[PDB]
Design an enzyme around this catalytic site. Structure first.
Site, short mmCIF file in Angstrom:
data_model
loop_
_atom_site.label_atom_id
_atom_site.label_comp_id
_atom_site.label_asym_id
_atom_site.label_seq_id
_atom_site.Cartn_x
_atom_site.Cartn_y
_atom_site.Cartn_z
N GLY A 41 -17.07 1.72 0.38
CA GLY A 41 -16.61 2.11 1.58
C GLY A 41 -16.28 3.64 1.73
O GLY A 41 -17.28 4.23 1.48
N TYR B 231 3.24 1.03 1.90
CA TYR B 231 2.11 1.85 2.05
C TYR B 231 2.54 3.14 2.69
O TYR B 231 2.31 4.36 2.29
CB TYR B 231 1.32 0.95 2.84
CG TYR B 231 -0.36 1.80 3.20
CD1 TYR B 231 -1.20 1.54 1.97
CD2 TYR B 231 -0.54 2.45 4.06
CE1 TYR B 231 -2.38 2.36 2.00
CE2 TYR B 231 -1.80 2.92 4.28
CZ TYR B 231 -2.62 2.87 3.29
OH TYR B 231 -3.88 3.42 3.32
N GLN C 96 -0.72 10.47 20.62
CA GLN C 96 0.20 9.79 21.59
C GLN C 96 1.44 9.21 21.10
O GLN C 96 1.39 9.17 19.62
CB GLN C 96 -0.67 8.77 22.26
CG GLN C 96 -0.97 7.80 21.51
CD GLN C 96 -1.97 6.63 22.21
OE1 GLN C 96 -2.05 6.84 23.35
NE2 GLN C 96 -2.39 5.57 21.70
#
Ligand code: MG
Ligand code: MG
Lengths: 251, 251, 251, 251
Positions: D17, D155, D251
């Site tokens: 990854g 997390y 946002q």
């Protein structure tokens, strides 16, 4: 009760909505208040609905008017004594992206939302410093001073400007022992008459993807944090941002 | 007065300094309070100095003790009724850079400052959700949760952790209509007995290059913002950071 | 090398200091560049010192001039082809606190630092959207867009404004699949000729209480992050702030 | 090309990854690289797929293993010479709210995501300081280090911890002239094999209410910002956060 005893406050745009709620709570907590607005018929009714002239009065004023700010302070001093507290609440919004914003729209919005706040902050520092008033300037920013909205370009600009300019003021006042604090308040979506005049607006704002609590706030939500910031309870808080947004900026 | 009527609060590390000031103000505003600490001789004296057992009691507890948290909640429920408010205030500091931090120091600091806050937040959500209490969890972070300090590595880590974990909790509670709010408080330098036991510490902290106001704060400065967050006045505030630091993070 | 092949960039205030360094690195990486400035004698020399007219040219322009922006884009398109990249770098500073800022100073600073950036961003979106250019608008903010400085009131305002307005633009462009990204760059103190003309300025800026690295930066420090943001390497970055400040905002 | 000439890098979790993309780009730019992972069959294949042993090698290591970190550094020094660059990329996620997180889950996630990063940062400072290497530690945080997610409690905690602990390290290294920089990288959603193994995940992440660009990123998006931070191009950047998120946090 009594949390604002002895304080003398000016609240711009205090004849309706959030401003009126702040004024109401200020008077309840012992402050003397001058509210401003554009229309005298509305302003005079608003004042009377809150209290007597010994408690609250109205002054016709557009916050973009630099000279009027002087008259506004002179008028409040004449009615209540030295001003200790200023809430820069007046503001307008345009629903346009940066791309579609006309220059005229840009200038008119900044005249009220940015120039107005500058004029009031500048004068407030000058008139309130070194008088042992426990003075406090509360500048109304918005969640739109933290995050962008694709359809509020100019508004974003103004609110981002107010957020950081306020830190400059806070620091200068602190370093010079002026006994003036400056902080910003950042409301999320709040139910005001405006919102009510816009069908579907409240529902769109209440979607969980926008406001996680699934409902919007009410004017008193902003009034209570303003009481704290105007009071001596917040004497060690300056240059900070206070957010009341139902979780909007947490995600 | 009466701003916390009906609330039942737990304040960890509430026998001295900031915690004790919060407890004191909570009781003054109508809350029933359980304070925790490590030493019963100190805790029992602290409680008695604030009020009677119908108002405030002490429970011996180390916040790093997961099982003790259960007993702590059961004990408070037995004394006062359902818990509505949790202030996760207990914490320790190590004066070491990341480079010089031993693994033992790392683990012990995180056990209190991070695991402890997790254990209390997790349990608080479980016990307070869906009871119409207007519940509120106030997690004590620090200016050290916003900015680094070269000599507070582990502490920085813990306070940065608390800041964002609290947002996760706020969101989950909001999205599920749990009637639990979670917010963090970020004190700057505050005068506590500890500080007093460290010659030169207050003067160093008061330098304008650190705290622009040129002096440090006092425990009541933190107590007043905690009253606001525990009260229904802040019902639309969740997932937010409240900073009271004399301008430290504004420059 | 070749990191900006095919890109056509406008850099405002690109005849000296930071702007010139950005222009230099852009040309080195394959971009065609139009630099702007107020004085043609300086601008033409600057361009020639970097490359030939097929690589870089100068256009006389004041960023506060709305109509000139149109001519500026038309001129660049005529010389190099469709514009893909805009660096809004031109800016001025006034060394005054909010309290001591004259209205004239306020308006002149905002004309360049805020109106100018708005005019360039608005037009850039209009001219660059939907052309598959991998377009990028880099708005120069500052560490002064994050924190206050007691002697940079107006500047703080402008830089805070640019920071959040840029997020609005980023979002609108992203949501509409315009293929335009907008990001802000936030330099700390950088050694430029200006600084050199101010005895003691570099030493004051290098104090550890201001810049932890104990020295200020150089124009290439800003040029390299601008290359990354103008390039397709940053194709997933929009609405973000990139800070290069020697640790200033980390404490 | 040549942007990392002479650099010697360790990348944890570099066999798949994002880590693998970083390793690939590092080797392309002239760095010598040691990648770590848990399974040797995968690691050895990954290394060979990128280059020869004179360019890149594999070391079996779990980042939660304190003693293994020493062996890891000794092994890299033996293969390539003094280490100049450390990318703390290894991490795991649990999909649970704070409320539903087991203590076991809490501890295992923090062991990798927080303890691991601490162990690597601490040792990196010790081994890289004062050697004129232009050393750089890149700590992988996440957008989850800025905002909460109701289903990523632990997390969030770990990523918030890494964000601020890194600032402490940056400051200490800067103030002591160690020639070590520390910065955090904050990816938004990135397409990795994991994501591909989760039907509907990519579509959910691509919704405009989450990622305004309407699509998620790819591993190279993170690799390119890591090249910049490992290179001498970023010599004035330390204690900063670099966000590559397709607009998620704007946002
Ligand atoms: Mg957000
Ligand atoms: Mg600072």
């Amino acid at each position: 009760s009594n949390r604002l005893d002895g304080k003398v406050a000016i609240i711009t745009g205090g004849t309706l909505g959030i401003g009126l709620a702040i004024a109401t709570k200020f008077v309840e907590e012992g402050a003397k208040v001058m509210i401003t607005g554009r229309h005298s018929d509305v302003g005079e009714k608003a004042a009377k609905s809150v209290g007597t002239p010994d408690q609250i009065q109205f002054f016709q004023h557009d916050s973009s008017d630099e000279d009027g700010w002087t008259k506004l302070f002179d008028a409040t001093e004449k009615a209540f004594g030295p001003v200790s507290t200023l809430v820069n609440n007046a503001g307008i919004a345009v629903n346009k992206s940066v791309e579609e914003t006309t220059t005229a729209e840009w200038r008119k919005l900044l005249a009220v939302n940015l120039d107005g706040v500058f004029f009031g902050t500048r004068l407030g520092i000058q008139r309130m410093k070194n008088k042992g008033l426990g003075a406090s300037i509360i500048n109304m920013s918005s969640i739109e001073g933290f995050v962008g909205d694709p359809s509020l370009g100019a508004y974003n600009a103004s609110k981002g400007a107010v957020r950081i300019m306020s830190k400059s003021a806070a620091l200068d006042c602190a370093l010079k022992d002026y006994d003036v604090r400056v902080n910003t308040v950042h409301p999320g979506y709040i139910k005001t008459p405006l919102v009510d005049d816009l069908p579907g607006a409240e529902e769109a704002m209440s979607q969980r993807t926008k406001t996680p609590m699934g409902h919007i706030g009410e004017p008193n939500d902003i009034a209570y944090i303003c009481v704290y910031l105007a009071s001596n309870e917040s004497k060690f808080a300056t240059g900070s941002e206070f957010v009341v947004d139902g979780g909007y900026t947490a995600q």
